[PDB]
Amino acid sequence: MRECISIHVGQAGVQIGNACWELYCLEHGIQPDGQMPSDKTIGGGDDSFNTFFSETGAGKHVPRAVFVDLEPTVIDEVRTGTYRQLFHPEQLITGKEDAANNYARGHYTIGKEIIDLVLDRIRKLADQCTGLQGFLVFHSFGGGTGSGFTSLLMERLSVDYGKKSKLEFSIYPAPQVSTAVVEPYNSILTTHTTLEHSDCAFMVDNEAIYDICRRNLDIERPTYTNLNRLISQIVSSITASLRFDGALNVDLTEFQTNLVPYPRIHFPLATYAPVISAEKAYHEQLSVAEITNACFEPANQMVKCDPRHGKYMACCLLYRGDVVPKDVNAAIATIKTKRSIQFVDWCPTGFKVGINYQPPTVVPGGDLAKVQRAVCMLSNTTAIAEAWARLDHKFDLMYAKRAFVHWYVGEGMEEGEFSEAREDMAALEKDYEEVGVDSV
Amino acid sequence: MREIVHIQAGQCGNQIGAKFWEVISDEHGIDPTGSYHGDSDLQLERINVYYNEATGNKYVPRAILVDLEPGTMDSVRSGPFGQIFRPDNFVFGQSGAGNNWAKGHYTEGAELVDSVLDVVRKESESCDCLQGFQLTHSLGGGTGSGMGTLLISKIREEYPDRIMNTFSVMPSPKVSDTVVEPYNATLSVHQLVENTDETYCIDNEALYDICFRTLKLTTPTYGDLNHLVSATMSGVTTCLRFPGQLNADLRKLAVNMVPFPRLHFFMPGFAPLTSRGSQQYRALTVPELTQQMFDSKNMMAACDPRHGRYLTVAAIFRGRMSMKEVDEQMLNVQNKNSSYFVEWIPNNVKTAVCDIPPRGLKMSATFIGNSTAIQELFKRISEQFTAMFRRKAFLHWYTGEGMDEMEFTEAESNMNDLVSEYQQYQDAT
Amino acid sequence: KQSSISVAVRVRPFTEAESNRLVKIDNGLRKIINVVDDRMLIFDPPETNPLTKMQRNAFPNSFKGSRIREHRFVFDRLFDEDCTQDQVYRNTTQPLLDSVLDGYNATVFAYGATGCGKTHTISGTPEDPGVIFLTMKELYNRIEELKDTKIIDISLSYLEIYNETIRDLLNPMTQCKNLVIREDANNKISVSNLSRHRPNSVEEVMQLILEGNKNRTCSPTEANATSSRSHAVLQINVIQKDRTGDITEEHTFATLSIIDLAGSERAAATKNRGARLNEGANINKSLLALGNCINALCDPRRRNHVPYRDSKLTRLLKFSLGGNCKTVMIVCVSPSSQHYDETLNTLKYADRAKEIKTKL
Ligand SMILES: CC(=O)O[C@H]1C(=O)[C@@]2(C)[C@H]([C@H](OC(=O)c3ccccc3)[C@]3(O)C[C@H](OC(=O)[C@H](O)[C@@H](NC(=O)c4ccccc4)c4ccccc4)C(C)=C1C3(C)C)[C@]1(OC(C)=O)CO[C@@H]1C[C@@H]2O
Ligand SMILES: Nc1nc2c(ncn2[C@@H]2O[C@H](COP(=O)(O)OP(=O)(O)OP(=O)(O)O)[C@@H](O)[C@H]2O)c(=O)[nH]1
Ligand SMILES: Nc1ncnc2c1ncn2[C@@H]1O[C@H](COP(=O)(O)OP(=O)(O)NP(=O)(O)O)[C@@H](O)[C@H]1O
Ligand SMILES: Nc1nc2c(ncn2[C@@H]2O[C@H](COP(=O)(O)OP(=O)(O)O)[C@@H](O)[C@H]2O)c(=O)[nH]1
Ligand SMILES: [Mg+2]
């Protein structure tokens, strides 16, 4: 089988998960109460939903998810909402306060009081998986829970599993926009978990999605729901090859093999090209070439970084809908003719391509238009280092005076860690500068 | 689940607390008899934060009313919401403090502190998880400052790892209803700087200015000032009681706003304040609220932020609004007013958003600033304190109750050290 | 003008047990500490013999181990494994005996993690007495030498800081609320209700030290069965006046402070937790405050305001760290890899006093 286990940690993770599971239920015909009408109507027995759901004898489809948060508020919103009957009642909550935006509470003091329960539920889920493919972890770098507890959980999962893949879909701090004063500390301290215990980490910036919503969808006042829906579409694109048929199917192992050249360079950039409102869906052809060109536009990147200031190390184009391979080959040739899109000299091939026959499904009340074609581009490039460097500068401004450090050291974290993480981040930056240099 | 214990001390604290409980009961649908007659299921979802459930589907506030005379207790009991409080929580003596810090801290408050702490202990172990405490009082008086500081010390000893807030009414330079305010204020700030995680400084002068200018009231009374303070108090705790896009409990605000342990004196403010007959002339939107929060006239602490730099700010919004708008408005405030924000903190503004606005507004916002301008308040007290302490003006009333001049010198030194620490992070560096 | 604060780091020698436990791989343990000069230290050097195959990858051909863990620390004073306690005593605490005999204050800090060797240094064995014994012995010898033309008087106190509360060690009965710090107008700090003792020789001083150490607030089940959860401050007040000189109402005063610091703690080691989390939090906060104070004092710029009031320990030593007072800091570190992470933290704590950039 082709199972995947989703782990949503913190407020950002849980809300992205709400969007994700809404989308998956709509894609597979599952209703919020968990019942599939197509089973009783057509007859069933010829459907593939095991990647994200487990079927009981009575016909209820329980998602393979584990929602975790150190405060009850967001999960309590989940258990009173439309999807209260979907999830197993074991949605994990600490019966105490949150991490208060500091890594120490999520890692050392308050996070140790649910880690056993979380690992027990992950055990119970994985034992029901015959063909487990990997973990999909959702969190935020800038949060206390989404840094400390995700670090602790991924340490434990690496100790327990090791061989299984682990994919992060994290919300990285924006250059200018922010919603907390101690984001640089939490995000720097999260470098170890996302560099040593992950296998492919996808980073997303709220400012980039805000600009995408403004420019493309014509939404001057987007809230977090639109961001979560767009991220959900990206995750649906990544995991579509495990659920539907296609001319070229790309599972997680093939994708990682083609995209990760060395064990440490596993921080690609995602891009969903045909983000278009219904009004602009007309007046546009939305051909394969146009969407592939839109992928490489710097304005459409989901991280505030300029790909023109770096060299692409690898690319993976995952197409959905009415796409023929020859159109993709023509588009890739057009991209290779362009000079602004520079590839390293040691990856002459460059492009991994997958094609799927299932077009994207539109959520009612959503912003994206109904499109016959879609593509998700996952690009391993050296420009992403810029997004790190800015963050490091913020850290260097606060740690010089040891501001806000007493909160961290008063919850079981030694001071030297603040330096150590920074050093690790610097080392990572050096690697990203040492791979783009051309061969002698 | 995140229970707060509210303690009222002195006349000012008791009156602010009575108005605050009226406001919170209206917010949660609790009637004066203690029954729930709301219209939405969110009010009862987190009622345990401020209330305990009594048998007949009743809700008793988790409040403790303290004083050294029974007049204010009689006033609160006879008020509209006097019958909602637990009678055992009313703790009072018979001999007052007489506007003396020593009486309410050494002689007449020391006798009553055991009873008050017994009630506090009873109200603490009945909670599934205690978030922290919440004291309302004034520093310019006797029993307020004295018993509040004593209870702060003893609760901090008993519950060292729990949040302790304090909504303390500073004395003002212009408004002065008491002659010995500087001594009491200095002796109380000596205790608050060491045993509190958040101290929300409030001044009667700033509240009167808000009433005269923003609200255009002709004859403001203490009810209106208590109304403003209660609005801020309700706003601070909004994310512990209602859902939102960005949740921020008290500890998160403390972590974001307190760069160093002793810099925890905050200026509060409430955004949508407008005069009746001038509400149809404005569009209640996020930019208007943001412009009103950072205006010098909207602060409740009687300090000019233009005479200093913001170490940190926290904006707690309530209502349906887009996160993009809030993020750009905060970035615009910081970029346009870069001179009033420290350079060695890149983002100075913690942001929280709650999905349920107050009852009659489509949106609202609470401002909590940590700036160096608060320095000025302490400076003013010193300028009075020394002028009274160089000659030992009204000092025998304090030394007669076992105090020494060493305590006065220590308090003055600590307050000047706090002033120096705030002044350190003001100039460009 | 000059650096009154001086940092001394001491490297202990492998114990025969450890020297034969896992160093056999060399013929797993390795000397992560390398000593090059009296002011130079290399942490985690790339001195392993079978190592070329690793930088075959670290260079731009296989990015799996490109991280560089070699650190280069510089300190005012460094003691290798071969140096004995006499050199440490001469080069760290002996000059302070002059200043206290001259009139100025003096301070000694002792820091390290478990197994670092701090006890051997400060306390030592009866055959090999520690630094404290030598200091007090020479102090009393100097007093006997200056018995003519001057009279000296020695007062001893020994307190501990635990959970930001003071606790007399020589008079355990006194309650904490009674012990309060007081700043006189003479720029002197005195703790109320201190049990001051007048020992007559170094034997009595050591006897008082063991009597106090019997009472220290320790707890078991940590890497060491008798780990310390408090900062122990021993104060020796020297008050002297001319014997046959001018009989005037003026006698000169000085203090020698010796502070044994509790080691920093990472809750990750703790599992069951409880009040020990509170103890660790207080210890870590106090160490952070002390580091901030020392760094500000060394820095010419930030010392317009030094955060003395952030902890009781720094508040007590307000007039024992500045320009006039001479401060020394003995930081004992281990070379075994078994204590790798902890040692790094220790090496990072000492470095903060003066961030001497060794890239030059
Ligand atoms: C026509 C209209 O929109 O009515 C408003 C109103 O006119 C204005 C002027 C209200 C009004 O407030 C005042 O007149 C006032 C006077 C002195 C001091 C403080 C307020 C209002 O009374 C106040 C009242 O506010 C509330 O109901 C809030 O929930 C408030 N709670 C209470 O006022 C309250 C007090 C005692 C018992 C029950 C409720 C609150 C505020 C913050 C946090 C929690 C609750 C509102 C909507 C109005 C009136 C009625 C005219 C204002 O009040 C607030 C706190 O928002 C004053 O300026 C604002 C903006 C409003 O436009
Ligand atoms: N894209 C997106 N980002 C979100 C969402 N909710 C929160 N965030 C981001 O999360 C960052 C802060 O981290 P939080 O999610 O609040 O941390 P937390 O998970 O609540 O952990 P605690 O602090 O312990 O409560 C902010 O910068 C937000 O931009 C969301 O719904 N969508
Ligand atoms: N500097 C040193 N010179 C010689 N032997 C040493 C030295 N440091 C430690 N040892 C030896 O190694 C043993 C273990 O170190 P030890 O001095 O007992 O640690 P400790 O000081 O008790 N640890 P801690 O109090 O947490 O700093 C000692 O008992 C000595 O036998
Ligand atoms: N906001 C408000 N302030 C008050 C009130 N009553 C008194 N004050 C202020 O508090 C000061 C008197 O302190 P008070 O609380 O009466 O002293 P206490 O009785 O010993 O606690 C005066 O300077 C007033 O400015 C009130 O009802 N509301
Ligand atoms: Mg949260």
Author numbering:
A (entry chain A): 1 to 440
B (entry chain B): 1 to 429
C (entry chain K): 22 to 48, 101 to 433
Authors' text:
Kinesin-8s are dual-activity motor proteins that can move processively on microtubules and depolymerize microtubule plus-ends, but their mechanism of combining these distinct activities remains unclear. The pathogenic yeast Candida albicans expresses a single kinesin-8 homolog, dubbed CaKip3, whose motor domain shares 60% sequence identity with that of S. cerevisiae Kip3. To understand the mechanistic basis for the dual-functionality of kinesin-8, we obtained seven cryo-EM structures of Candida albicans Kip3 bound to either the microtubule lattice or curved microtubule end mimics, and a microtubule-unbound CaKip3 X-ray structure. Our findings implicate loop-2 as a tubulin protofilament shape sensor that regulates conformational changes in the kinesin-8 motor domain, which can either induce curvature of protofilaments at the microtubule end, leading to microtubule depolymerization, or enable forward displacement of the neck linker for processive motility if the motor domain is bound to protofilaments in the microtubule lattice.
To investigate this hypothesis experimentally, we designed and expressed a mutant version of the CaKip3-MDN construct, whose long loop-2 was replaced with the short loop-2 sequence found in human kinesin-1, HsKIF5B (CaKip3-MDNL2-HsKHC), which does not contact α-tubulin in any of the available microtubule-bound or tubulin-bound kinesin-1 structures. In line with our hypothesis, the cryo-EM structure of this CaKip3 construct bound to microtubules has a docked neck-linker and closed nucleotide pocket in the ATP-like state (MT-CaKip3-MDNL2-HsKHC-ANP), unlike the CaKip3-MDN construct with a full loop-2 (MT-CaKip3-MDN-ANP). These data show that the kinesin-8-specific elongated loop-2 acts as a tubulin tether on the microtubule lattice pre-ATP hydrolysis, preventing the motor from closing, and that removing the CaKip3 loop-2 residues that interact with the microtubule lattice enable the motor domain to form the closed conformation in the ATP-bound state. To learn how the loop-2-tubulin interactions and motor domain conformations observed for microtubule-bound CaKip3 relate to its motile activity, we assessed the microtubule-gliding velocity of the CaKip3-MDN and CaKip3-MDNL2-HsKHC motors. The gliding data shows that elimination of the CaKip3 loop-2 increased the microtubule-gliding speed of the motor by over threefold. Our microtubule-binding data showed that CaKip3-MDN has ~35-fold higher affinity for microtubules than CaKip3-MDNL2-HsKHC when AMP-PNP occupies the nucleotide-binding pocket.
